[PDB]
Amino acid sequence: KLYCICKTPYDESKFYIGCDRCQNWYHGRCVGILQSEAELIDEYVCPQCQSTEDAMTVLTPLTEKDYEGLKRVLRSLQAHKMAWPFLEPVDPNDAPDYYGVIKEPMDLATMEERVQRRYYEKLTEFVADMTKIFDNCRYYNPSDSPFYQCAEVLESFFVQKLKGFKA
């Protein structure tokens, strides 16, 4: 009865564009799209639906192609200059109290094993394990320590590398 982001009655004198996801119609004007502009995109996706698609990328099942992606992402992390602390499980000999302080240890080799055995079913689970690596480090190590700074840098890197991951 009311349409578009503007919540107005249907007016057949006006140009509408239809969202291919929700099938609701939107004034071309309210979405910044002229008629000549609409004949160049194949599938319009409206503001509300688009943010839903954005949000659900981390929750949809990991495809075979996504798994190729996780392997690449992991490889770029393992190669990063700041990833040296995170390549393997912490050695108790290097930090005798570590496994008493850190309840859920995580590291890149363990994550590689998990990718190998297709342990992850959604992107959010992979991200959760990566986030554990960084949160543990920031928890165990002082803020002025290069270990902590390495976590800060690598997390920032990872967040960038994850943009446009999923189809």
Binding site: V90, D94, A95, P96, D97, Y98, V101, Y139, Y140, N141, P142, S143, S145, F147, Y148
Partner: peptide
Amino acid sequence: GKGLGK
């Protein structure tokens, strides 16, 4: 850092 250190 809650830990004794590395």
